Enzyme design. Structure first.
Site, short mmCIF file in Angstrom:
data_model
loop_
_atom_site.label_atom_id
_atom_site.label_comp_id
_atom_site.label_asym_id
_atom_site.label_seq_id
_atom_site.Cartn_x
_atom_site.Cartn_y
_atom_site.Cartn_z
CB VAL B 11 -0.95 -0.01 1.19
CG1 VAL B 11 -1.94 -1.20 1.03
CG2 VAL B 11 -0.13 -0.13 2.51
N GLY B 12 2.16 1.13 0.05
CA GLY B 12 2.97 2.33 -0.10
C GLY B 12 4.43 1.97 -0.24
CE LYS B 13 9.82 0.09 -4.26
NZ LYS B 13 10.59 -0.53 -3.09
N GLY B 14 8.44 4.12 -0.69
CA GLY B 14 9.24 5.30 -0.92
C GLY B 14 10.67 5.12 -0.42
CD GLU B 18 8.72 -2.80 -0.89
OE1 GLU B 18 8.19 -3.82 -0.40
OE2 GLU B 18 9.34 -2.80 -1.96
CB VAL B 19 3.56 0.24 4.37
CG1 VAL B 19 2.53 -0.38 5.28
CG2 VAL B 19 4.52 1.22 5.09
CE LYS B 32 9.06 2.53 7.60
NZ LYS B 32 9.33 3.72 8.41
CG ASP B 133 9.65 12.33 9.89
OD1 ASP B 133 9.35 13.38 9.30
OD2 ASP B 133 9.88 11.30 9.23
O1 LIG Z 1 0.14 2.59 5.29
C1 LIG Z 1 -0.67 2.14 6.06
C2 LIG Z 1 -0.26 1.80 7.46
C3 LIG Z 1 1.09 2.00 7.89
C4 LIG Z 1 1.48 1.70 9.22
C5 LIG Z 1 2.81 1.93 9.67
C6 LIG Z 1 3.49 0.91 10.37
C7 LIG Z 1 4.80 1.11 10.80
N1 LIG Z 1 5.43 2.29 10.61
C8 LIG Z 1 4.79 3.34 9.95
C9 LIG Z 1 5.50 4.58 9.74
C10 LIG Z 1 4.89 5.64 9.08
C11 LIG Z 1 3.59 5.52 8.60
C12 LIG Z 1 2.90 4.32 8.82
C13 LIG Z 1 3.51 3.19 9.48
C14 LIG Z 1 0.54 1.15 10.09
C15 LIG Z 1 -0.77 0.93 9.66
C16 LIG Z 1 -1.16 1.26 8.32
N2 LIG Z 1 -2.51 1.02 7.89
C17 LIG Z 1 -2.92 1.34 6.56
N3 LIG Z 1 -1.97 1.89 5.65
C18 LIG Z 1 -2.47 2.21 4.38
C19 LIG Z 1 -3.42 1.39 3.79
C20 LIG Z 1 -3.96 1.78 2.58
C21 LIG Z 1 -3.57 2.99 1.99
N4 LIG Z 1 -4.15 3.38 0.74
C22 LIG Z 1 -4.50 4.75 0.61
C23 LIG Z 1 -4.98 5.08 -0.81
O2 LIG Z 1 -6.14 4.31 -1.07
C24 LIG Z 1 -5.75 2.94 -1.09
C25 LIG Z 1 -5.15 2.53 0.24
C26 LIG Z 1 -2.65 3.82 2.61
C27 LIG Z 1 -2.13 3.44 3.83
#
Ligand SMILES: O=c1c2cc(-c3ccnc4ccccc34)ccc2ncn1-c1ccc(N2CCOCC2)cc1
Ligand SMILES: O=c1c2cc(-c3ccnc4ccccc34)ccc2ncn1-c1ccc(N2CCOCC2)cc1
Lengths: 296, 296
Positions: B11-14, B18-19, B32, B133
């Site tokens: 659901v994300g990469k940069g 990646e997540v 993550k 951050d």
């Molecule tokens: O990314 C996440 C996510 C990330 C973390 C996380 C875990 C560990 N460290 C972090 C550091 C920074 C930011 C997040 C985390 C924890 C829980 C999370 N639940 C959901 N989604 C996520 C799921 C979907 C989406 N899209 C958005 C656009 O429409 C489609 C789906 C965007 C984000």
């Protein structure tokens, strides 16, 4: 209620005013009658006792604070519990200490000082409080061998919720003999509440010194003496202290016999960590508390 | 415990890695996977979860940290609760807000941030923690309309048990777009813990701006934009940001229509008090929480 106190004998007197052994409701009480020039301290201590929840085993407990007229003139009184063993200053000259007694004294003080310095949130909480006149005459000895801290007239307060350092408006300054280097040389960051805690810690190290001297080891003990007894006179001036502490960089001497006792060895190390030039390098009250809790 | 998770979609990469939405014991989890360059952030955040009792409704809950070999390489994983509504950055682009849902979002952030910042004592306690951050991509939106704060990779810690500031050893620095003035001009007092809390408040004010733009009032709303979208490009440089924020003293523009809505009027004032050039003038997190609690 001041009207109903019978004053029995004066047990302390100085520039601050007088303290009397009094009788109230069949019990002994202590009554501090402030001098006409120390009214701001009465006001500050009345402020804390009426606004801050500040009950603790090792903080002197207040009974009441009154304004009374004694023969056509208003006196400011503070009425507290009475402690027949007297201040730590007098007590140390009247007895020596064993290891248990010595550690109960200095731990109870650290516990009192840590409770002042820490903010508590919620219903029955309190801001952080720096004492600013900590010394052995401002500590009372209880019958159970612990102490409690007295004299909040210079307290400064702080609450994390605010940028608000509450310094009051009192011209009184701390006891010169116990002033930290940054107070004597006027580099103390007056806008920073943490600076005041580090001043309390400096002065705590001196009290620790004073008490450790009176603990017996290997059959010997040092005479009671106040901090810097050897290099300043009685009632030392500001400049006397500045010369000794700031210009000459002196610190209280550690008697050599302390290194033949493990408790005194641990207390020597502890007190020297109260005395760093850099206030940021000194132990916190809570670290001292924890350390003294483990010492044996 | 990474072998018990099946990764299903990215659901994300940069630059950070990646997540993934993973599957574990009947539930979604977020995984993550850190990039090679960001190893120290995994270490820091694993250090925190292993040495600090950190539990709060508005702080992303950690499930585990693991090391695992995939593709004959070692991946560093952080496994957390999953939020299908995405980050605040995603959610603000999906929808507009009414007054209640706008305040629920920014109050819950303040509440998480206050909890990081404040030191707790006893067996349920923790050191004070500055985030460093904070941004809309590091905030997750929950189904109940509240948020939780993620990403402790740059966190700095402080406790009343030691006067040493626990910084990382992390070359990584915060997201340039949200860096405070005292960071950009390198005048931040690196040794003072308070100055890192003040950096979070700067960033929090910027998040508040982003959220406010999406609250509808009198049928008016703004498009989603990131802070400073109008004066720096995507992925701004350190100089880009220093010229805008320090040299020009620029601040995100307040839409006039906010001053026709009492809630956004109160939010505009609160933002202003996050953006002072003088860090010590800025509100604390606790006072922000308290103010947002009383705004209707
Ligand atoms: O990314 C996440 C996510 C990330 C973390 C996380 C875990 C560990 N460290 C972090 C550091 C920074 C930011 C997040 C985390 C924890 C829980 C999370 N639940 C959901 N989604 C996520 C799921 C979907 C989406 N899209 C958005 C656009 O429409 C489609 C789906 C965007 C984000
Ligand atoms: O002096 C006190 C005393 C003073 C305060 C007190 C109240 C308000 N503010 C203060 C500020 C600084 C220090 C004390 C106080 C509170 C309780 C107190 N109980 C006892 N005695 C006291 C009693 C007896 C004695 N002798 C002298 C040496 O041993 C035997 C008897 C010496 C001192």
């Amino acid at each position: 209620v001041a009207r109903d106190i019978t004053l029995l004998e004066c047990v302390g007197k100085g520039r601050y005013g007088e303290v009397w052994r009094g009788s109230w409701q069949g019990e002994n009480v202590a009554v501090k009658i402030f001098s006409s020039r120390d009214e701001k301290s009465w006001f500050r201590e009345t402020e804390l006792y009426n606004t801050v929840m500040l009950r603790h085993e090792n903080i002197l407990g207040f009974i009441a604070s009154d304004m009374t007229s004694r023969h056509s003139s208003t006196q400011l009184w503070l009425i507290t519990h009475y402690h027949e063993m007297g201040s730590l200053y007098d007590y140390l000259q009247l007895t020596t200490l064993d290891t248990v007694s010595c550690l109960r004294i200095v731990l109870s003080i650290a516990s009192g000082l840590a409770h002042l310095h820490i903010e508590i949130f919620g219903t029955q909480g309190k801001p952080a409080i720096a004492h600013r006149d900590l010394k052995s005459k401002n500590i009372l000895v209880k019958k159970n061998g612990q102490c409690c801290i007295a004299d909040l007239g210079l307290a400064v307060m702080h609450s994390q919720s605010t940028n608000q350092l509450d310094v009051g408006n009192n011209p009184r300054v701390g006891t010169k003999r116990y002033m930290a280097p940054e107070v004597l040389d006027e580099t103390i960051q007056v806008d920073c509440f943490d600076s005041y805690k580090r001043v309390d810690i400096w002065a705590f190290g001196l009290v620790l010194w004073e008490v450790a001297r009176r603990m017996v080891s290997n059959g010997i003990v040092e005479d009671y003496k106040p901090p810097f007894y050897d290099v300043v006179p009685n009632d030392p001036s500001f400049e006397d202290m500045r010369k000794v502490v700031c210009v000459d960089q002196q610190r209280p001497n550690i008697p050599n016999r302390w290194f033949s006792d493990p408790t005194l060895t641990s207390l020597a190390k502890l007190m020297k960590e109260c005395w760093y030039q850099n206030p940021s390098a000194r132990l916190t009250a809570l670290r001292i508390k924890k350390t003294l809790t483990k010492i044996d």
